[PDB]
Design a protein around this ligand. Structure first.
Ligand SMILES: Cc1cc(C(=O)N2CCC3(CC2)CN(C(=O)OC(C)(C)C)C3)cc2cn[nH]c12
Ligand SMILES: Cc1cc(C(=O)N2CCC3(CC2)CN(C(=O)OC(C)(C)C)C3)cc2cn[nH]c12
Lengths: 691, 691
């Protein structure tokens, strides 16, 4: 025992495995539920400081497989795990779910066989994933591993013989490896008969049993670990489309561990903990040369957070847990449950303070969450303090995160107007490679920002099951050679595919000072998914096939300009070229304003390509009731689905509204539905007996 | 008329639009059905030279919208199209479908308003896509366009007035644009009243109608073209998952046209025809400098074929059509129809001649399709002349194409063992940018090859609805810094996602000289999709978590080596370090062979991670009956699905087999099912009345 004379018992001594985990730079597996309790408790303090919490607000039960291989809840002492994979079912009362919400936490035990994945770990992880999926509850994975378990048939090591070319000279080589009849008998004695595949021969009176295949008696040596790896890869891929999946990389994550991080999609990387495929030393051995210095050079946050593999970084394990808990606060308690409403001090009924200007540079986050000024706080479109940005280290041209609109959680996509630089590090394997700095213009989709946009759309849809708002402000895609070669078309197409798959309401809003041109409009038009999408343009937004300069270049040419001087200029109506030379600068501007007068929200309304033109200051009030109304109608459409189109379903639901309700008034419709949920339920139940 | 005195009529004069299309370097739209007839006729000649074709073997009917907007077949003279989008329903008797197969061909008319997409073109394209989808038939798109239609309100051009700052000095600027009461009256006269949005004011007795928004009387000017663009983007995204989709880029393809190429996925690019987003000239205007020289520098085959955007290139339009027709020959006639069997001279019953060797370099295509040698033709695994390679210009480390196995069409994925170089061109926008040459090791998945593998899997599954074979031979993924930074994990994960979605039989086969290690095995294990996947290893293949060198480094260390000399070496059993120094080279090799003896197909069978170990020479005979048996059982499983698991369904089907049939004999099972299809149908019909 060390240290001696401590006020309370030494936990690292009571359970020596706690100390091993600490030595390896991570939280001991059985101490993670405590971090969840701490993080959950902080969630309450930051929400309502006055709240009194008892310990019944949080329950953690370890899940273990029974005799029949069925998962069951147990209360046992930490460190009694027979396998290197552990799980807990957590029930927590949270501000969003005061009566309680559940989730499963699966974790590798880094103290058990270096946190390697053997077949039993692989089968348990899969069983826990299925348990979560069946229940529709979130699956949190805590990665601290060494990848697939590696081994050799240790019993064949002290028994094998080598059939030398020349017994006297071993350096002359060998023909094969074999067993003596004494060796075979050792195996027959210990029942490990099937540990080898032998072909018997006779060489100089001696009977040799030639080793044709070494199998081993111990399970978890090779290909059986790889089968399990593939099994848990498939399971995680499936879970991502079914439940909320998140991973915290808490110590290193290797091989299958790295793939699991990615297949679960949403990931938080603790600083200094690498996500690697093959270690740096092994790569150097393969390369001959000493190319790489460390594993963090390969999979640190400097790589993975900049890649977009890691959605967020965390200073330590508790910060990682706090981030999980915060992310979860926007997510339904279980699959197909409503999005968790959480109204705070910042209510729906207020105008939007922060307003962008054409003449002044801004951070889109100010339009989202507001900004601190010397003269007080300027409120943005969403609730103060509700913006939770993710994928912040990658493709910084698009801003993605979760927010709240009068308590309603949703995913937000905004456009960074400022030029963005990214540093491509120098390739250690190429001596003629130097670090490159890429600069990307604002309001233009590039391969990385198009990929991030599509990724965001998918991560909001799958598991999170959230509505979304896109503050659409793009000039188009980078049409240049480098970006065309870097497959900008491929990533742009993923955006369309993500919108087609979207199952919750979408609001596309061209904000003030915002634009949407040819290429950018195509990829975000509400006709991509009419069932879920609707578009709105601010009165101070612009949209058209080309930018005005482009339109004038194709349709307001010199002949048309001169015919305009020959109409508007008295003096003009070699004596001409002197007049032309003085008028062209202003007559250029006149055509440029003529083109711009077509690019207005009023044209968009006239042509019926947008639902409404809006005033930025009044957007929060409008979107709160439009979103609330939309969630209520969507609920009614889902209930009716228990064989008709959406158009027929919504017509039927709206035929139930009193004759006096204006179908175009969002507040009235939302208010009526909420006042009549049980009445509407009775109606629905009456229709069920009619099918 | 020119030329004069030709033997037959001058078609380019009879229809002047034919000449315009030719001048622009493309086939005239109405002449494409003829290219399909020519290509289809060649298909027959290359199959059976003796066949006699009449003109009834091929029918092409133009599809046009009727009064109610419903598509109908018409016989009219070319060039009578009121819109710039045309379609044909083609019915062709082919070697695979001698009684006929159908498909729709949609094409832009480059002679109609430069092949721009206006709302009517967008609505027609969408109607044709829906027509194809409803019928389950392939949709061929021929791209020859200028993107979304651009325009201005031409009627407001001769009427607008400018409200100058100083009437005498125009160069001093202006305040707004306006209309006179005479201008307003011109609009009122021609009914174009709603062409402008005006706000009336009085300035110096004069009544000015200030232009607040220019709308226009003509449809197809701006945002209405963008709405249609998004509509056809969504439709194509959807079609790709539903029917066989292919695009031939026959003249330039711009903006929405470029996205359509990509959303349809499968594309053939005619040499010299660019796929661009923004033209080179417009980019230069935006850039200030003269950065780009041509549109082919941005979207030529040098870009798109090297990207993998273009699956194939074609010398001219007929070569493009021939490639469509050849690709289609592997595809079912309509959605959910069986894969088209086409038995040729090269029958199933033969061994595989071409065999790879460890000591000798080979082209994987020889293992696939065979090779010509001086001593005659060495047959490969698949039918002679059946390999149709696609994505040949991109990520040349993986070989992807369609082939036939005794007539059965399937998708093939093979590993290029040779080192692959690719040339990244120099960025014209960066003066400090020089062309880079990347070299990639064989048998290693890199970001591009992992992406190509996933892409291949998806393109075989969607629309093509084919079974697949992967000749799995990878050491793993590139774990190095450059490839980790270039998101190798992301692309590796797409492989898993593609396999999870696979709906047809899959065969994973580790070939002779082939390997599958830690990282590579995870992503292709049959437990990712147990319902469709099965794995096989050649007797001369290897598999384990690490390569032998890796295994020895972790589990056969110095203490273990010395304990082996202290057991096997009489002389060994400062007098030691001299012995150690002489024995370590051979004792290294002994441990290296000890590790390798675990990496065998016999271990794979023992541990039950593979279905069977195989002999390469006998693989064609085995896979032909295994695949045939699998297609028959899959058919029966689909019929039974008209509420149980797959395991229950296949148990039921196999309970119908006579007691004497061996469920493990593929040939016997396939033979019995094919002899009893109608008998099994009767059984199925009897069960229907029991639900
Ligand atoms: C002057 C002018 C403009 C546009 C237009 O509408 N653009 C918007 C889309 C872009 C291109 C200009 C901006 N994007 C771009 O790559 O910008 C980078 C900053 C290079 C990354 C593509 C069309 C035309 C046609 N003729 N003259 C035009
Ligand atoms: C010697 C040795 C080998 C392996 C092994 O199994 N590898 C297979 C997978 C690779 C890495 C070596 C090959 N890949 C690679 O990047 O190869 C490039 C050519 C660089 C592109 C990753 C593991 C270990 C562990 N200790 N010592 C090892």
């Amino acid at each position: 025992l060390r240290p001696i004379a401590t006020p309370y018992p030494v936990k690292e001594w009571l359970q020596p495995k706690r100390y091993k985990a600490h030595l390896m730079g991570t939280t001991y597996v059985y101490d993670f539920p405590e971090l969840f309790r701490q993080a959950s408790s902080s969630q309450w303090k930051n929400f309502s400081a006055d709240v009194k919490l008892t310990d019944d607000f949080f329950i953690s039960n370890e899940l273990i497989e029974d005799e029949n291989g069925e998962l069951t809840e147990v209360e046992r002492e930490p460190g009694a795990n027979a396998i290197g994979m552990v799980a807990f079912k957590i029930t927590v009362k949270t501000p969003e779910y005061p009566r309680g919400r559940q989730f499963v936490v699966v974790a590798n035990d880094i103290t058990f066989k270096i946190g390697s994945f053997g077949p039993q770990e692989d089968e348990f992880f899969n069983k826990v994933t299925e348990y979560a999926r069946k229940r529709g509850i979130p699956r949190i994975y805590l990665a601290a591993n060494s990848g697939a378990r590696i081994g050799m048939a240790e019993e064949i090591v002290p028994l094998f013989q080598v059939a030398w070319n020349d017994a006297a000279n071993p350096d002359k080589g060998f023909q094969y490896l074999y067993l003596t009849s004494e060796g075979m008998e050792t195996l027959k004695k210990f029942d490990k008969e099937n540990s080898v595949l032998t072909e018997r021969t006779v060489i100089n009176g001696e009977e040799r049993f030639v080793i044709k295949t070494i199998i081993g008696s111990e399970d978890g040596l090779g290909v059986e670990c790889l089968r399990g790896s593939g099994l848990i890869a498939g399971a995680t891929s499936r879970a991502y489309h079914d439940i909320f999946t998140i991973t915290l990389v808490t110590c290193r994550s290797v091989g299958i561990g790295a793939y699991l991080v990615r297949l679960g999609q949403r990931a938080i990387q603790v600083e200094g903990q690498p996500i690697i495929l093959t270690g740096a030393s092994a790569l150097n051995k393969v390369l001959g040369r000493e190319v790489y210095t460390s594993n963090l050079q390969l999979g640190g946050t400097q790589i993975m957070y900049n890649n977009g593999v890691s959605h967020l970084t965390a200073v330590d394990d508790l910060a990682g847990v706090e981030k999980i808990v915060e992310w979860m606060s926007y997510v339904p308690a279980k699959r197909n449950m409503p999005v968790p409403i959480l109204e705070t001090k910042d209510t729906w009924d207020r105008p939007v303070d922060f307003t962008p200007t054409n003449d002044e540079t801004y951070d889109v986050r100010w339009m989202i969450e507001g900004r601190e000024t010397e003269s007080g706080f300027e409120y943005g479109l969403f609730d103060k303090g509700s913006f939770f940005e993710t994928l912040s280290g990658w493709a910084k041209g698009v801003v993605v995160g979760r927010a709240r609109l009068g308590g309603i959680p949703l995913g937000v996509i905004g456009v960074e107007t400022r030029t963005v630089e990214n540093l491509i590090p120098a390739d250690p394997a190429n001596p003629n490679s130097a670090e490159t700095l890429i600069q990307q213009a604002g309001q233009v989709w590039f391969p990385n920002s198009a990929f991030k946009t599509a990724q965001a759309i998918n991560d909001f849809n799958n598991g999170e099951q959230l509505p979304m708002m896109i503050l659409a402000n793009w000039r188009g895609f980078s049409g240049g050679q480098r970006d065309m070669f870097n497959e900008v078309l491929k990533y742009g197409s993923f955006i369309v595919d993500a919108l087609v798959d979207y199952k919750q309401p979408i609001i596309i809003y061209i904000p003030p000072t915002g634009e949407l041109r040819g290429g950018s409009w195509v990829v975000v038009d509400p006709t991509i998914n009419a069932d879920q999408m609707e578009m709105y343009a601010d009165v101070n937004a612009r949209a058209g096939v080309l930018e005005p300069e482009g339109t004038v270049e194709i349709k307001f040419r010199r002949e048309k300009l001169l015919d305009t001087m020959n109409r508007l200029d008295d003096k003009y109506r070699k004596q001409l070229a002197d007049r032309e030379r003085e008028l062209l600068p202003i007559y250029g501007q006149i055509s440029l304003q003529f083109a711009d007068l077509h690019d207005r929200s009023s044209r968009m309304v006239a042509k019926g390509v947008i639902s409404k033109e809006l005033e930025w200051t009044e957007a929060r009030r409008f979107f709160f009731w439009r979103l609330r109304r939309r969630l209520n109608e969507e609920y009614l459409i889902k209930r009716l689905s228990h064989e008709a189109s959406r158009l027929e379903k919504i017509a039927r639901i709206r035929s139930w509204y009193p004759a006096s309700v204006d179908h175009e008034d969002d507040r009235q419709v939302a208010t009526w539905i909420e006042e009549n949920y049980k009445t509407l339920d009775d109606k629905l139940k009456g229709l069920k007996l009619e099918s």
